[PDB]
Amino acid sequence: IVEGSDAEIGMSPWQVMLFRKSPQELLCGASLISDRWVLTAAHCLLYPPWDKNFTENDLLVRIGKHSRTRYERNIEKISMLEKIYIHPRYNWRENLDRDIALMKLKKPVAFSDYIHPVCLPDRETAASLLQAGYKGRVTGWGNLKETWKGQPSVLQVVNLPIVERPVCKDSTRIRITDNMFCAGYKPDEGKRGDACEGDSGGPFVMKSPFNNRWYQMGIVSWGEGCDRDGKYGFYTHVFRLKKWIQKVIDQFG
């Protein structure tokens, strides 16, 4: 996260770290959506242009974390994966369309002050809140700058406004789809902030003013550089992929 700040303790209790077993390193962010299911970006697990194709036994999920690198004894919980599910129409060849994956945990995780699931939005909550200018919140342990202050000691947080779709489209040569939205400040707005490498797969959340609950509207998906003027971060549109999420969980849960 570029131009963010340290999270408060328990601020993002659904935040998950995808952790490579060997070598031991951060792979991606993710989010907890129930006691057994974790949501991430498909490109965190499968991206053939970079020879990335992880299997369940390659990875662990670490839940309840705040420090990036420390083993947070008595706070974090580490879970193994039973199965990965990648959207069957995930477009890794072109533009990361439908950049979404689910991971089922081997055993349910115990909730705590530091571990708690986020909601996924209904049609009406999505329609009300996914509007240009409305701000959401992105969290992760990724890079603090596009090139390298390099990597953070603790989880970082930034609040960013959703951008009008024509502005998103006009900022890039990549083909954007209805399964994506973009967020970030414009050059004239002064303020800054963005996701970056390592934040992939983490959540873009909004706090509903109707029921005071947090909803995950997006998944950190792609950008061109990090925090560049006139560029924006792109997020998988969670609601647009609801039918697939529900089909996977209804069938394999």
Binding site: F19, K21, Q24, E25, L26, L60, T69, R70, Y71, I78, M80, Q151
Partner: peptide
């Protein structure tokens, strides 16, 4: 750069 995690999680 990461602190080792308990061995039980790598079995």
């Amino acid at each position: 750069d990461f602190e080792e995690i308990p061995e039980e999680y790598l079995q």
